[PDB]
């Protein structure tokens, strides 16, 4: 029915899609700190794809988690760990979407999907 699928060739791994639509998490799971100056993450559903950029001295450090945070979830910035994402807001839920993680020279490092089926 409602089917993950995810993957990473590095230290940071898209950790969860929202089911509800207002964030997108990720996680350091290394033992290295990771530079994400530069890094884009990107969300589509159907047709559309949306970019988050990372700013030039983004660090998810060893162990840690980020979250991205809709522009209007009510959540206030709280730097490294919760992060907004600039006009834009919550996107719905139960739609298929796939989330994309770019590092800052356009290699895709990692990915997940949620799939909604009957």
Known sequence: SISHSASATGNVCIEEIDVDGKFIRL???????????????????GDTSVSYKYTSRYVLKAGQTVTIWAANAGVTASPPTD????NQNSWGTGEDVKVILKNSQGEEVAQRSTVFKT
């Open 27 to 45: 996680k350091n799971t290394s033992e290295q700190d990771q530079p994400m100056g530069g890094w884009e993450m990107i969300r589509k559903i």
């Open 83 to 86: 992060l907004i994402w600039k």
